[PDB]
Design a protein around this ligand. Sequence first.
Ligand SMILES: Cc1cc2nc3c(=O)[nH]c(=O)nc-3n(C[C@H](O)[C@H](O)[C@H](O)COP(=O)(O)O)c2cc1C
Length: 138
Amino acid sequence: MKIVYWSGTGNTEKMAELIAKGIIESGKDVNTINVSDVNIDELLNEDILILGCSAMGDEVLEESEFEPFIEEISTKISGKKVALFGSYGWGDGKWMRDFEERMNGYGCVVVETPLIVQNEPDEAEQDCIEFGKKIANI
Ligand SMILES: Cc1cc2nc3c(=O)[nH]c(=O)nc-3n(C[C@H](O)[C@H](O)[C@H](O)COP(=O)(O)O)c2cc1C
């Protein structure tokens, strides 16, 4: 499987690692890719797209790299399964409610409830591993 993410300080990156750990513990392989090093062509062959990005700007996806990437793949992902995650700070998840609505609008099937964790995953570490286990079980 593949996990593509954007992280500004490392919080979403850590969530990605823990989610990968859960998939691996389930007996499956998985690669975590920073959005800047992603190959759209190969990514589109995946059964499930695992995407993560922290809450940026005023409750939006990161604008210079992650957002353009979502727009790029938007026309080629209808019917695909997606799992969404990300770290946030002061809000209550508005950027993720919007991200989920958006992916749904592109024709994707959001397999699990988006996983959002405030700041760094410390107390939420197991939740991250469990999210990975749920995904590897689909
Ligand atoms: C420029 C900027 C804008 C932000 N906007 C939001 C926001 O609208 N809502 C929110 O809850 N957190 C917001 N945050 C906080 C980050 O989502 C939060 O610090 C998160 O843990 C960062 O994860 P990262 O290291 O993966 O990027 C913002 C952070 C920055 C730097």
